[PDB]
Amino acid sequence: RGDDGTTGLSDMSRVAKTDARLVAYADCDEANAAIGAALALGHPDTQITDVLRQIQNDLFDAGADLSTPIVENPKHPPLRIAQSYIDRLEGWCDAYNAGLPALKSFVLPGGSPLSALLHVARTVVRRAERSAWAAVDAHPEGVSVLPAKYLNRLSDLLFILSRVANPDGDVLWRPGG
Amino acid sequence: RGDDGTTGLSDMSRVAKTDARLVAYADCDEANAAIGAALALGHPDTQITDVLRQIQNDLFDAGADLSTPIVENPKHPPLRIAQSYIDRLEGWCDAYNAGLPALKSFVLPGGSPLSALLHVARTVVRRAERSAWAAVDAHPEGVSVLPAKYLNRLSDLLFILSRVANPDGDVLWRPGG
Amino acid sequence: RGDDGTTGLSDMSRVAKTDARLVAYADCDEANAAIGAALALGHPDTQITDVLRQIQNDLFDAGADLSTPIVENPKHPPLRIAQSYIDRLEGWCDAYNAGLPALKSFVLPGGSPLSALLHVARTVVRRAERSAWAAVDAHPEGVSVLPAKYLNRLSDLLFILSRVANPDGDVLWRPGG
Numbered sequence A, B, C: 001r002g003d004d005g006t007t008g009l010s011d012m013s014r015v016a017k018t019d020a021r022l023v024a025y026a027d028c029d030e031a032n033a034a035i036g037a038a039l040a041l042g043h044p045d046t047q048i049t050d051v052l053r054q055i056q057n058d059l060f061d062a063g064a065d066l067s068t069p070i071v072e073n074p075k076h077p078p079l080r081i082a083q084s085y086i087d088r089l090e091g092w093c094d095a096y097n098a099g100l101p102a103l104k105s106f107v108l109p110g111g112s113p114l115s116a117l118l119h120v121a122r123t124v125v126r127r128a129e130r131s132a133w134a135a136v137d138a139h140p141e142g143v144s145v146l147p148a149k150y151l152n153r154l155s156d157l158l159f160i161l162s163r164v165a166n167p168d169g170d171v172l173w174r175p176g177g
């Protein structure tokens, strides 16, 4: 309970394959792959493609952050998620939500390949957010909360974009119906 | 270890982003999205579409149940999964399994887009079932077992439906082969 | 905390639906389904299809291993992953990596349906590997490490194969860019 089953963080330090930090950046990888599948199978417009590819780049920045313990006075300044990343996601949320009708209930996920795979990506990003909070909980001084805050806003954006993309419009949940 | 990293259940009460109840209803969302991708990329018949869309509606009923703590004498009667939901899944299992050949081993998942994505959905539903049992284990008096029992029968149905949809028939596992 | 929420290992012994061994073989199922979706939606060459179908067969061998407790002098010899399985994955890694250009950074996942879904499968296999290590950690004498070692090499192969399949070539991460 030995080197089998261990691996390294970005500073080379050794962690279990079940380490909370690693689980968080692994789930960012899984989210990034879900976004790649939305791009590859969904056929998005050029503008949505550019947004999603920036997000895929951002997710590696988030994994770099999560994989790099916070230390006092580091050798060289680490790559970290900054508030500016979240401000950018919010700007996109506002712009893409402007034309959507008001929604009063849950929507059944699906629609076009693109809208359905943006819902898949949304749910995987939300899973990554939970893992990112668990990493902060395990290392309150050594892990940034900004990766988790980024993933939180990203799932808002992916919901909005699934609605933009959906040719079925909003198919509403009917509670108990 | 602070309001960062917390959110709300349906009664507004505060929970960690890693709370077992939340993880259970989040995995129902992820399962619902997997079913949406099967619909969107798989091109199912009208009858299978109607069944799967009812299931997607049911999954929000299950998430409403899991997100709403059980209390004595509630203000108003909560939406909960009932045995009738599971009886309906079983009726569908029986009807769709009737024409299938007897199976004597595991089948390699895949086939058409629809059959392959019904296997993906099956595995995500089984993951949600595990999370739903973990929520009951964490709150034996406050969480219903019926969401987990529903998810259990749903994975049976999704297996059956993947076989119906599969144009490759049953491609059998060859142990050690 | 009762038979509700329990199930059986291959020797019939009773385990929780959250048992580490079960979670490991369940995640092998989820990985197997992700590979099936890559096959079904990605349109691979005959050679890649044959490799991936052998891997799908291997994943059931790995689940059989994980589901069967190790005992002294068993009734009959159990099916287990052997080093030969990993040697085969390594041979495939070497052959398929030979023509690829040297890579100096992370690649954004996506590309064709096939390359994008091989990245999805890669990330799910890595999740299964973590679960397989957690099963060993829970049962250091009763669970083999070879399923986890197999899943480790499999994620290397799925990375390599995603690069082979990708018509976009290598789209590189630009840190902070």
Ligand code: B12
Pocket: A008, A009, A010, A011, A012, A025, A026, A028, A029, A059, A060, A061, A062, A063, A064, A065, A067, A079, C103, C104, C105, C106, C107, C108, C109, C122, C126, C155, C156, C157, C159, C175
């Ligand atoms: C954390 C981590 C990850 C995380 C998070 C990464 C993130 N940023 O989101 C995740 C789980 C996503 C990951 C995935 C993989 N990783 Co990784 N990862 C690391 C790790 C520990 C730190 C990376 C980091 O973020 N550095 C911080 C950034 C700022 O550093 P940087 O200035 O960009 O410089 C990095 C890159 O140049 C990178 N790099 C250099 N050569 C190559 C070659 C390849 C193929 C890749 C992918 C990267 C890579 O390494 C530098 C130092 O980290 C390193 C080991 C380490 N101790 O540094 C391995 C490492 C980069 N990973 C590696 C590999 C192989 C992979 C995977 C191919 C594993 C797999 N089979 O799935 C994938 C690739 C995913 C992709 N889409 O490209 C190798 C790459 C070397 C090699 N064998 O080619 C490394 C060096 C570990 C090792 N030696 O075995 N990884």
Ligand code: B12
Pocket: A103, A104, A105, A106, A107, A108, A109, A122, A126, A155, A156, A157, A159, A175, B008, B009, B010, B011, B012, B025, B026, B028, B029, B059, B060, B061, B062, B063, B064, B065, B067, B079
């Ligand atoms: C549990 C929960 C979930 C769970 C489980 C839900 C289920 N039933 O399966 C999951 C994880 C699936 C979920 C997902 C989301 N949720 Co939610 N969720 C909740 C929560 C806590 C309870 C919902 C519930 O089940 N109520 C029980 C049922 C019976 O109530 P009801 O009579 O149907 O009335 C509900 C609906 O009318 C709903 N509603 C009203 N306006 C709108 C608008 C939108 C867009 C949505 C989705 C719902 C919604 O809110 C009422 C009260 O809950 C509420 C907050 C709360 N305290 O009530 C948030 C809430 C409904 N969720 C919200 C949001 C934003 C989302 C997501 C878009 C988040 C995301 N980015 O992924 C997704 C949408 C998924 C979808 N496909 O539509 C918001 C919606 C308000 C808004 N900002 O538009 C709420 C109100 C929380 C908040 N204020 O920030 N959620």
Ligand code: B12
Pocket: B103, B104, B105, B106, B107, B108, B109, B122, B126, B155, B156, B157, B159, B175, C008, C009, C010, C011, C012, C025, C026, C028, C029, C059, C060, C061, C062, C063, C064, C065, C067, C079
């Ligand atoms: C571990 C386990 C799994 C694991 C790992 C399996 C692996 N090898 O990777 C996972 C989670 C993948 C799994 C999935 C399922 N399983 Co399962 N599983 C088991 C279990 C506990 C052991 C299987 C094993 O690996 N045996 C070791 C190998 C070497 O044994 P073997 O010589 O091949 O003989 C096996 C097969 O012939 C198999 N078998 C015989 N008849 C049939 C019929 C079907 C449809 C299947 C799938 C298998 C099957 O059972 C024998 C003994 O295990 C058994 C129960 C048990 N106690 O044996 C159930 C069992 C095989 N599973 C069963 C079922 C139903 C399923 C699922 C359909 C559940 C679902 N709805 O998702 C899927 C099918 C996945 C697929 N793609 O085919 C049933 C099959 C009987 C039936 N009702 O038809 C069994 C017998 C349990 C039960 N009675 O309820 N399972």
Ligand SMILES: C[C@H]1O[C@@H](n2cnc3c(N)ncnc32)[C@H](O)[C@@H]1O
Pocket: A125, A126, A127, A129, A130, B007, B008, B009, B017, B022, B026
């Ligand atoms: C919309 C509802 O979803 C829940 N919620 C908030 N964050 C997450 C997350 N990362 N993953 C799953 N569910 C979450 C909360 O209960 C919120 O009110």
Ligand SMILES: C[C@H]1O[C@@H](n2cnc3c(N)ncnc32)[C@H](O)[C@@H]1O
Pocket: B125, B126, B127, B129, B130, C007, C008, C009, C017, C022, C026
């Ligand atoms: C078919 C086999 O799958 C296992 N099993 C039962 N329920 C689940 C679940 N939600 N998820 C994963 N595996 C499960 C049991 O071991 C069963 O016998």
Ligand SMILES: C[C@H]1O[C@@H](n2cnc3c(N)ncnc32)[C@H](O)[C@@H]1O
Pocket: A007, A008, A009, A017, A022, A026, C125, C126, C127, C129, C130
């Ligand atoms: C490439 C990097 O990915 C991490 N790593 C190693 N194994 C896994 C795994 N199963 N899942 C997620 N990440 C892992 C290590 O940090 C390694 O250095």
